[PDB]
Scaffold this motif. Structure first.
Motif, PDB file in Angstrom:
ATOM      1  N   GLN A 108       0.826  -1.322  -0.149  1.00 46.66           N
ATOM      2  CA  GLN A 108       0.081   0.149   0.094  1.00 46.66           C
ATOM      3  C   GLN A 108       0.896   1.340  -0.038  1.00 46.66           C
ATOM      4  O   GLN A 108       0.272   2.259   0.357  1.00 46.66           O
ATOM      5  N   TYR A 154     -16.711   4.755  -4.219  1.00 42.34           N
ATOM      6  CA  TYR A 154     -16.165   5.760  -3.359  1.00 42.34           C
ATOM      7  C   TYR A 154     -16.243   7.071  -3.982  1.00 42.34           C
ATOM      8  O   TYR A 154     -15.862   7.184  -5.040  1.00 42.34           O
ATOM      9  N   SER A 183      -8.558  11.533   1.935  1.00 46.87           N
ATOM     10  CA  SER A 183      -9.495  11.380   2.893  1.00 46.87           C
ATOM     11  C   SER A 183      -8.731  10.080   3.616  1.00 46.87           C
ATOM     12  O   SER A 183      -9.328   9.777   4.509  1.00 46.87           O
ATOM     13  N   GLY A 184      -7.662   9.508   3.414  1.00 45.49           N
ATOM     14  CA  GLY A 184      -7.118   8.515   3.774  1.00 45.49           C
ATOM     15  C   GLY A 184      -7.041   7.090   2.943  1.00 45.49           C
ATOM     16  O   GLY A 184      -6.359   6.325   3.107  1.00 45.49           O
ATOM     17  N   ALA A 185      -7.920   7.486   1.919  1.00 47.86           N
ATOM     18  CA  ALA A 185      -8.070   5.936   0.902  1.00 47.86           C
ATOM     19  C   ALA A 185      -6.924   5.640   0.209  1.00 47.86           C
ATOM     20  O   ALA A 185      -6.102   6.610  -0.176  1.00 47.86           O
ATOM     21  N   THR A 186      -6.501   4.498  -0.049  1.00 51.80           N
ATOM     22  CA  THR A 186      -5.628   3.953  -0.964  1.00 51.80           C
ATOM     23  C   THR A 186      -6.120   3.167  -1.794  1.00 51.80           C
ATOM     24  O   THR A 186      -6.815   2.135  -1.488  1.00 51.80           O
ATOM     25  N   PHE A 187      -5.629   3.148  -3.148  1.00 52.05           N
ATOM     26  CA  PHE A 187      -6.155   2.120  -4.153  1.00 52.05           C
ATOM     27  C   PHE A 187      -5.046   1.815  -5.153  1.00 52.05           C
ATOM     28  O   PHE A 187      -4.135   2.323  -5.253  1.00 52.05           O
ATOM     29  N   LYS A 194     -10.043  -6.935  -2.466  1.00 53.79           N
ATOM     30  CA  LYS A 194      -8.477  -6.738  -2.348  1.00 53.79           C
ATOM     31  C   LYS A 194      -8.219  -5.628  -1.649  1.00 53.79           C
ATOM     32  O   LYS A 194      -8.727  -4.818  -1.124  1.00 53.79           O
ATOM     33  N   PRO A 233      -4.687  -3.144  -1.311  1.00 52.04           N
ATOM     34  CA  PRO A 233      -5.849  -2.225  -1.241  1.00 52.04           C
ATOM     35  C   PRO A 233      -6.917  -2.474  -2.187  1.00 52.04           C
ATOM     36  O   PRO A 233      -6.655  -3.158  -3.189  1.00 52.04           O
ATOM     37  N   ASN A 234      -7.911  -1.595  -2.070  1.00 52.37           N
ATOM     38  CA  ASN A 234      -9.011  -1.919  -2.937  1.00 52.37           C
ATOM     39  C   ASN A 234      -8.650  -1.624  -4.637  1.00 52.37           C
ATOM     40  O   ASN A 234      -7.854  -0.735  -4.692  1.00 52.37           O
ATOM     41  N   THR A 258      -3.509   7.273  -3.758  1.00 49.52           N
ATOM     42  CA  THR A 258      -3.569   7.887  -2.455  1.00 49.52           C
ATOM     43  C   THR A 258      -4.605   9.247  -2.342  1.00 49.52           C
ATOM     44  O   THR A 258      -4.345   9.882  -3.312  1.00 49.52           O
ATOM     45  N   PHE A 259      -5.530   9.532  -1.365  1.00 50.42           N
ATOM     46  CA  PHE A 259      -6.426  10.427  -1.255  1.00 50.42           C
ATOM     47  C   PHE A 259      -6.012  11.083  -0.077  1.00 50.42           C
ATOM     48  O   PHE A 259      -5.757  10.443   1.123  1.00 50.42           O
TER      49      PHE A 259
END
Ligand SMILES: CC(=O)N[C@H]1[C@@H](O[C@H]2[C@@H](O)[C@@H](CO)O[C@@H](O[C@H]3[C@H](O[C@@H]4O[C@@H](C)[C@@H](O)[C@@H](O)[C@@H]4O)[C@@H](O)[C@H](O)O[C@@H]3CO)[C@@H]2O[C@@H]2O[C@@H](C)[C@@H](O)[C@@H](O)[C@@H]2O)O[C@H](CO)[C@H](O)[C@@H]1O
Ligand SMILES: CC(=O)N[C@H]1[C@@H](O[C@H]2[C@@H](O)[C@@H](CO)O[C@@H](O[C@H]3[C@H](O[C@@H]4O[C@@H](C)[C@@H](O)[C@@H](O)[C@@H]4O)[C@@H](O)[C@H](O)O[C@@H]3CO)[C@@H]2O[C@@H]2O[C@@H](C)[C@@H](O)[C@@H](O)[C@@H]2O)O[C@H](CO)[C@H](O)[C@@H]1O
Ligand SMILES: CC(=O)N[C@H]1[C@@H](O[C@H]2[C@@H](O)[C@@H](CO)O[C@@H](O[C@H]3[C@H](O[C@@H]4O[C@@H](C)[C@@H](O)[C@@H](O)[C@@H]4O)[C@@H](O)[C@H](O)O[C@@H]3CO)[C@@H]2O[C@@H]2O[C@@H](C)[C@@H](O)[C@@H](O)[C@@H]2O)O[C@H](CO)[C@H](O)[C@@H]1O
Ligand SMILES: CC(=O)N[C@H]1[C@@H](O[C@H]2[C@@H](O)[C@@H](CO)O[C@@H](O[C@H]3[C@H](O[C@@H]4O[C@@H](C)[C@@H](O)[C@@H](O)[C@@H]4O)[C@@H](O)[C@H](O)O[C@@H]3CO)[C@@H]2O[C@@H]2O[C@@H](C)[C@@H](O)[C@@H](O)[C@@H]2O)O[C@H](CO)[C@H](O)[C@@H]1O
Ligand SMILES: CC(=O)N[C@H]1[C@@H](O[C@H]2[C@@H](O)[C@@H](CO)O[C@@H](O[C@H]3[C@H](O[C@@H]4O[C@@H](C)[C@@H](O)[C@@H](O)[C@@H]4O)[C@@H](O)[C@H](O)O[C@@H]3CO)[C@@H]2O[C@@H]2O[C@@H](C)[C@@H](O)[C@@H](O)[C@@H]2O)O[C@H](CO)[C@H](O)[C@@H]1O
Lengths: 98, 99, 100, 103, 103
Positions: free
Chosen positions: A3, E18, E44-48, E91, E93-94, E41-42
């Motif tokens: 990640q 999302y 908002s904290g999101a990782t893809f 998965k 990360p998503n 990465t955003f």
């Protein structure tokens, strides 16, 4: 799957993270036989290559694409994951922010 | 591997480094049969091609042509070219840019 | 090898050089069956294509030419000359040169 | 060959010309299996797709489909004004056959 | 065919939308063997990710994976606002199935 670049990098042998935190100083590109490579340089004195070259083939070409456009737009690179058993160190991954 | 354009160029016979230190004046591109090539020009008077593919280097020729086009359009300052001088115009082997 | 669009043009039959000295007025691109082509247009009234594919070297080149026309149009880049086959309607682009 | 999008459009069955004269409102791109497609939207309320490549498409169209998706992305990102779209209207959303832009 | 990212998302299993309404914070790209992937990465904290091509991918997805990665890079570099993401949530990360951007 990892990640972050640091997580990804820690999965491989003979790698290290370089914190670059800077735009690319120079971009070199060669189509000379057996040196079909890209070379980037930073004002830190750091020099990196994308090595001469099957899903890795597409990825190699993408990396060279990314370094070119990154140089052209003066985009700030955050980190590079590189193989340090090559001279110059060969790029395995790149991260950029913000 | 080489660590600069000058080092890379030195590995080869029939090559020389041109110092451009300038943007490309003109870009010419052909899709005419047997002349699938790009030609670039500078106000120095220098003319160079990326040369028709013939007898790993195939993707590299394509990438060079890509690079020269976007370099022209963005008026990016080229530093040096490494070129083969056994061809006319001299054929590009490598390009470098500095910011 | 030829050193300019004019020299290159003179190596082929049924070609001529148009002096455009202007940006592209309109860009049209089709993916319709058997009309996979680009059409460009100028203020002058000139109309040109990149024509539907009929060598293995040429297939990559046709695609590059279309890429080039697209970004030339979006950046308002002045085209100096076009080398064109005049045995097609509209005339079919063999080469393009760009200079300000 | 045809010398305009309108001329070209008139050559096919089940097509019409939408006069857009506007930039793209939204670009949507999918790599989901069997919906490898692009959907574009305008503030007119118009929704269009580049169709998923399939048996209705001939070999020569495959690279053209990829090109059309390229164009729409760069068109969206640059806020480039689309003049006309030639679309097949036997699909939902209508399927892009051709696009034209005027400066 | 679906006419929006949400419609498309609803055709598939293990997906969710999302809503980002934000530019990409970070773009990571790797050519390391077996990790030929992009991660985004955003704020908002999101990782893809766009995941490595593999057996789970059908042949038509192969060009779409490459395209998705082309899109994300240029989205990052132009600071273009992403509207929504359709992600596979089985998965980590998503994994990105579709992307939409609006302005
Ligand atoms: C002209 C140019 O841009 N580079 C030439 C130069 O590059 C080396 C030097 O810049 C030295 C500084 O003395 O650093 C070498 O890298 C070290 C690295 O040092 C660390 O990172 C650099 C960028 C500096 O910030 C240092 O302060 C840091 O300590 C060490 O951590 C690493 O373990 O070992 C290398 C030594 O090889 C530069 O080498 C190049 O860049 C690095 C990133 C590697 O990829 C390496 O293979 C490269 O050669 O000098 C060399 C000859 O020494 C060449 O002429 C370069 O072109
Ligand atoms: C109009 C145009 O852009 N090009 C046509 C032109 O090109 C040649 C001229 O520009 C002459 C002027 O002297 O130089 C040739 O290059 C020399 C080179 O000269 C040096 O570099 C150039 C850029 C100038 O700055 C000179 O003052 C320098 O002395 C020599 O150093 C070199 O050893 O030999 C060449 C000639 O053989 C230009 O040649 C073209 O560009 C060079 C880089 C090569 O690629 C060469 O093959 C090219 O032909 O005139 C030629 C015919 O002479 C063609 O009409 C060009 O289209
Ligand atoms: C609406 C539009 O853009 N084009 C439509 C138009 O195109 C033709 C006209 O624009 C006439 C006007 O005279 O010129 C044709 O081109 C001539 C060409 O004329 C010269 O070049 C153009 C750029 C103009 O500047 C003229 O004033 C110049 O004298 C001659 O050089 C040439 O020998 O003959 C051609 C054709 O007879 C335009 O033709 C189109 O563009 C040219 C460059 C060719 O590609 C040709 O094949 C094209 O058809 O009219 C045509 C139908 O006649 C279509 O409706 C176009 O869409
Ligand atoms: C949310 C969104 O952007 N679009 C959704 C919407 O799309 C349709 C609506 O916008 C209606 C409004 O009545 O028009 C449909 O298009 C008609 C078209 O209408 C005219 O053109 C549109 C663009 C608007 O300007 C209208 O006000 C005009 O009347 C008719 O002229 C034509 O004969 O028939 C179409 C429908 O087939 C919009 O349909 C979408 O866009 C068109 C261009 C086609 O590609 C169609 O397939 C699309 O569906 O409503 C639909 C519900 O089915 C979806 O939710 C859209 O996402
Ligand atoms: C450093 C970085 O950017 N991200 C690392 C981080 O990511 C996770 C965290 O950011 C937490 C914060 O609570 O959220 C995780 O996502 C939740 C998700 O929460 C919603 O979305 C996020 C972005 C926030 O806005 C929340 O407030 C929202 O409620 C839930 O919707 C979902 O059900 O479950 C996940 C928990 O996994 C972030 O997870 C990452 O991003 C999501 C979208 C997935 O793709 C997941 O796989 C990612 O890990 O922490 C993780 C490890 O815990 C990594 O280190 C990230 O890099």
């Amino acid at each position: 799957a990892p990640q972050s670049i640091t997580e990804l990098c820690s999965e491989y042998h003979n790698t290290q993270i370089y914190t670059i935190n800077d735009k690319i100083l120079s971009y070199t590109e060669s189509m000379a036989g057996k040196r079909e490579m890209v070379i980037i340089t930073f004002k830190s004195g750091a020099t990196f290559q994308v090595e001469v070259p099957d899903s890795q083939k597409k990825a190699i070409e993408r990396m060279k694409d990314t370094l070119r456009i990154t140089y052209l737009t003066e985009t700030k690179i955050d980190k590079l994951c590189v193989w340090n058993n090559k001279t110059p160190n060969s790029i395995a991954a790149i991260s950029m922010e913000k």
